[PDB]
Amino acid sequence: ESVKEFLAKAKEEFLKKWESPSQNTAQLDHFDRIKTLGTGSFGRVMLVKHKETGNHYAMKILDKQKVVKLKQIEHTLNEKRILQAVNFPFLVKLEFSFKDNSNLYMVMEYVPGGEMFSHLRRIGRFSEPHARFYAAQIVLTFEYLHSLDLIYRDLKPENLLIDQQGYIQVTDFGFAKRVKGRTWTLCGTPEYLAPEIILSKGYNKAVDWWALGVLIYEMAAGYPPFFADQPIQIYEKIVSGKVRFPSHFSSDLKDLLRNLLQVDLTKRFGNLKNGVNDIKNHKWFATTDWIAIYQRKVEAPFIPKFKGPGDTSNFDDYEEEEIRVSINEKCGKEFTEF
Numbered sequence: 001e002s003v004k005e006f007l008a009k010a011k012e013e014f015l016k017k018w019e020s021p022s023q024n025t026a027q028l029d030h031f032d033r034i035k036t037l038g039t040g041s042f043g044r045v046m047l048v049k050h051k052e053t054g055n056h057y058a059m060k061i062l063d064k065q066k067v068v069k070l071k072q073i074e075h076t077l078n079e080k081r082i083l084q085a086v087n088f089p090f091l092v093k094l095e096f097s098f099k100d101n102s103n104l105y106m107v108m109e110y111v112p113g114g115e116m117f118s119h120l121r122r123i124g125r126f127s128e129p130h131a132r133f134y135a136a137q138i139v140l141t142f143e144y145l146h147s148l149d150l151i152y153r154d155l156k157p158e159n160l161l162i163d164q165q166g167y168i169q170v171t172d173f174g175f176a177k178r179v180k181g182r183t184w185t186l187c188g189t190p191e192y193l194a195p196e197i198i199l200s201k202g203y204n205k206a207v208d209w210w211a212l213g214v215l216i217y218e219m220a221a222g223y224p225p226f227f228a229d230q231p232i233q234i235y236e237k238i239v240s241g242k243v244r245f246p247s248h249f250s251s252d253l254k255d256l257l258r259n260l261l262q263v264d265l266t267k268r269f270g271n272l273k274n275g276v277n278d279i280k281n282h283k284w285f286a287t288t289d290w291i292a293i294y295q296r297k298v299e300a301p302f303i304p305k306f307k308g309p310g311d312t313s314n315f316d317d318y319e320e321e322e323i324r325v326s327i328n329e330k331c332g333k334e335f336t337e338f
């Protein structure tokens with residue numbers, strides 16, 4: 001009943017914001033640009049500083065014309081509408097959003113510890129306790145998102161930032177969607193795609209549980225379970241129903257992963273009648289205090305090294321390009337609801 005009532009309140013609060021989204025809550029010249037933190041085919045993320053408060057933020061800037069060209073309109077509207085409505089300890093907070101003649105802007109909390117990906121690659125692999133600490137946070141986050149009828153669809157180490165307490169903050173809702181039943185879009189990252197996405201089926205939240213299996217494997221091994229030089233070769237491995245485990249994996253870890261990396265979605269943990277409880281009650285999680293994780297009372301495996309809220313040492317270096325705003329409005333109609 002405790003979990004039922006928690007998730008019922010969570011859904012009520014989400015739906016109120018979902019139905020009446022916030023809009024136009026800052027503007028670009030309220031911020032100073034500090035550094036580019038990441039780049040993609042239609043946008044970038046920039047460390048900015050608010051000129052009046054001095055607070056640092058990560059500002060995601062999407063070029064409207066590129067969003068249209070790369071057929072990402074609905075996805076960008078999903079991302080903003082979802083992010084402004086969610087509230088969970090392991091989800092990055094959206095603080096402002098706005099648009100101008102050229103771009104869409106989402107201003108989010110800045111997490112100076114950087115991406116899990118960097119730390120994983122620096123250390124090689126995480127011990128099982130360390131992987132389990134992060135995995136537990138993802139399990140709770142997916143329990144929350146799925147109870148709101150949301151599918152995340154982009155779980156991977158680059159989208160999980162490590163905060164000042166060593167806890168995860170999930171970023172990048174670009175593929176997240178509110179789904180009743182099935183959805184069909186081909187999206188994600190090749191190594192993390194569930195078989196039913198590769199096979200062009202209508203799929204559901206089970207794809208997030210598959211991706212959790214991939215993430216746990218990668219955290220504990222140092223490399224993902226399905227790897228190859230070309231995506232088609234990765235996809236052949238994903239659909240095959242075969243996975244090999246390093247000998248150092250515990251038996252409990254192997255068993256959990258066989259049930260998350262189950263090619264038959266109707267047999268996959270997280271998608272059975274007992275839902276998330278098949279995962280939470282698995283022996284690999286026997287040492288996990290779920291409430292203590294949620295309350296952020298567990299001491300983390302490591303605290304990232306950084307000097308202060310504006311330090312960018314844990315992020316890498318990108319060419320610094322202009323944020324140009326056209327004199328003329330672009331794509332106004334397509335982005336009316338943003």
Ligand SMILES: N=C(N)c1ccc(O)cc1
Nearest residue numbers: 045058108110111171172
């Ligand atoms: N670097 C960050 N703190 C960050 C990155 C991406 C994002 O979508 C949100 C926040």
